[PDB]
Amino acid sequence: AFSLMTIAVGTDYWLYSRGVCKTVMTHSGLWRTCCLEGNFKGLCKQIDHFPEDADYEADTAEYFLRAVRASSIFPILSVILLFMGGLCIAASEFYKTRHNIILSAGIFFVSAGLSNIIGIIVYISANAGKKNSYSYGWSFYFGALSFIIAEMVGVLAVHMFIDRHKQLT
C-alpha cells in the first residue's frame, strides 16, 4: 500500500481530458499535466491554480478547496502516515514485548485511508468546475487500490493486537 501510493503520487496519468499542454487529450496529474495525440506529445507543464477568468475573490469555500488541491496535503499525508505505520511494523520485531506498537500501527494504516478518501474527494470536487468525456486512467485506480490494501493491513494489525493482549489475559 505504500508502494502503490508513491507510484500514484509520482506518476501523472490521473486524468484524461481535452486540455492545453503549452500556454488535445492530456496525461493530467496532481502536479505535472502532460499531453498525447498532438503535434506536441509529452511536453509536460506544471499545472497552476489560475485566477484568469476563474473570478474567485474572497471565496473562502473556493479558495480553501483549491489551496488544499494545489498543495495536495491529503495525498501527501496519506504517504507520511502510511510510512510511519510501516515504521511501527519494523519496530514490532525490534523493541519487542512492548505490544503497544501493534495498536499504534493499526491507527496509522486506517488513518492513511481516511487521508486517502478525502484526498480522492478534493481531487474530484476541484476538478469539475467542463472537460467532457473525461477519463480517470489507472493512476487514480492505484490510489483506489492503495485505499483498500491499507485498510486490510490496519485490519490485520488490530487482529494481531487482539491476540497480543489475549496472551496477556
Binding site: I117, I120, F147, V155, K166
Partner: protein, 380 residues
C-alpha cells in the same frame, strides 16, 4: 415518390422505364379518359417557378408555355401566379409548408439506469465510505478493556453487516453500546440520510422528465433562432411564398432568409435533406407536407416533422391555357377521387415503402408505468 426510375432503368426504355405516383396516376387517367401517353422528364431539374424577369417560368411551366408538352401530370403547386399562364385541374392532394429538422437524439436507453441519479464517482465513493466507516467502527469497538472486550458483538464482519444495514435503511439486531462506538454509528446514520434521500428524490426526477422533445417544434420557435438557420428550395413556389409575405411572423422569416450567412438555399430538396444531416441539429429545412412524410419512411430515419402545416395548398394536373384536352381530364381527377383511387394510389406508395416502421404518433401522457426493461438490472 412522384416519378422515380426503376432499379433496372438502364435496361428498360420507354414509358416502362419510369415508375412512381404520377406514373400510376398517368395510367389511371388514360384508362378512364382514353388516350395514350409518353413521359418526358424536364432537362431543368427545378419545378418551374417564376422566371428571372424572362417571364418564361423556368421549369415545368416553361415546357407548358412553349407547347412542347401537352399535360403536366406532376407535383406542381396550384398557386395564383401559375394560374394566369396555364390551366390547372382540381387538386389531387392536399399539403402544406412544413418544417423538417434533425432528430433530437435524446432517447438514451439503458440497462443499468437505476445507477443513473448518482454519478459514477459517488457510487465509487460510497463503497470507499462503506469500507472506511466499517473498519473505524471495528477499531473503536475492539480495544483492551472472561474478558470485558468480548461483551461487544462487533467483529469486523458484524461491522460490515451493521454499516450495510444502516445504509440499506433496514436496520440491524446489533447496535453500538460505547460512547466512541455511537459516534461512528451516528455520523454514518447522517451520511445515509442525505445520500439515500438524494437517490430517492432524483430517481423521482429521472422518472418524470425522461422524454424525447425538440425545442423548435413550432412556427414561431423556428422564426427566432439565428442558431438554427433555415432555408427552402430554390426556384419553387415555397420560395415564392415567402417573397410575398403578409403575416408578421412570416415577415420575420423573410428577414433571415435575406440576411443568410451563408446562402441557405439548395438546388434540389434532397440536397436540403442532406444539408440538415450534415448540420446535425443546427439548420432546418422547410419543405412540403407529402414530401416530408416520405422522407420519414426512408433510410436512415434521421429526420422528423415538427408542427402543423403553415398553409393548405395542393398539387394539380396542369394543361396550357385554352387546351381542349384537359376538360375531361378535370373529370378524370374527380373520378379517381370518387372511386377512392387517389386515396388508393396514395395508399400504394406511402404504405409499401414503410421500411422505418416507427409510426411515431407519440405518447403525450407523462404517467407511464415502468416497463421491465427499465429495471431489469436489479433482477440480474
Amino acid at each position: 415518390p412522384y416519378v422515380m426510375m426503376k432499379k433496372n432503368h438502364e435496361m428498360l426504355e420507354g414509358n416502362e422505364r419510369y415508375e412512381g405516383y404520377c406514373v400510376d396516376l398517368a395510367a389511371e387517367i388514360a384508362k378512364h379518359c382514353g388516350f395514350k401517353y409518353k413521359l418526358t422528364i424536364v432537362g431543368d431539374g427545378k419545378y418551374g417557378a417564376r422566371d428571372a424577369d424572362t417571364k418564361i417560368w423556368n421549369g415545368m411551366v416553361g415546357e407548358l408555355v412553349y407547347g412542347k408538352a401537352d399535360i403536366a401530370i406532376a407535383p406542381l403547386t396550384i398557386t395564383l401566379v401559375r394560374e394566369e399562364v396555364i390551366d390547372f385541374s382540381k387538386p389531387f392532394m392536399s399539403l402544406g409548408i412544413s418544417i423538417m429538422i434533425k432528430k433530437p437524439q435524446k432517447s438514451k436507453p439503458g440497462v443499468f439506469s437505476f445507477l443513473d441519479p448518482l454519478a459514477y464517482e459517488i457510487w465509487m465513493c460510497i463503497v470507499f465510505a462503506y469500507i472506511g466507516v466499517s473498519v473505524v467502527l471495528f477499531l473503536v469497538s475492539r480495544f483492551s478493556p472472561q474478558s470485558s472486550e468480548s461483551t461487544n458483538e462487533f467483529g469486523i464482519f458484524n461491522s460490515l453487516w451493521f454499516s450495510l444495514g444502516a445504509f440499506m435503511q433496514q436496520g440491524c439486531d446489533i447496535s453500538p453500546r460505547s460512547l466512541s462506538g455511537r459516534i461512528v454509528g451516528g455520523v454514518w446514520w447522517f451520511f445515509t440520510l442525505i445520500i439515500i434521500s438524494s437517490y430517492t428524490a432524483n430517481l423521482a426526477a429521472f422518472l418524470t422528465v425522461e422524454r424525447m422533445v425538440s425545442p423548435i417544434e413550432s412556427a414561431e420557435d423556428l422564426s427566432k433562432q439565428t442558431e438554427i438557420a433555415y432555408g427552402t428550395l430554390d426556384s419553387g413556389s415555397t420560395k415564392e411564398f415567402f417573397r410575398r409575405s403578409k403575416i408578421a411572423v412570416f415577415d420575420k422569416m423573410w428577414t433571415y432568409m435575406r440576411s443568410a450567412e451563408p446562402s441557405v438555399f439548395v438546388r434540389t430538396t434532397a440536397e436540403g435533406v442532406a444539408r440538415v444531416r450534415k448540420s446535425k441539429g443546427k439548420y432546418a429545412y422547410l419543405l412540403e407536407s407529402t414530401m416530408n412524410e416520405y422522407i420519414e419512411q426512408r433510410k436512415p430515419c434521421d429526420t422528423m416533422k415538427v408542427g402543423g402545416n403553415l398553409d393548405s395548398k395542393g398539387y394539380g394536373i396542369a394543361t396550357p391555357k385554352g387546351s381542349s384536352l384537359g376538360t375531361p381530364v378535370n373529370l378524370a381527377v374527380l373520378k379517381l377521387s370518387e372511386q377512392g383511387v387517389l386515396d388508393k394510389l396514395k395508399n400504394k406508395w406511402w404504405y409499401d415503402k414503410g421500411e422505418c416502421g416507427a409510426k411515431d404518433s407519440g405518447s403525450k401522457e407523462k404517467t407511464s408505468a415502468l416497463s421491465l426493461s427499465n429495471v431489469a438490472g436489479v433482477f440480474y
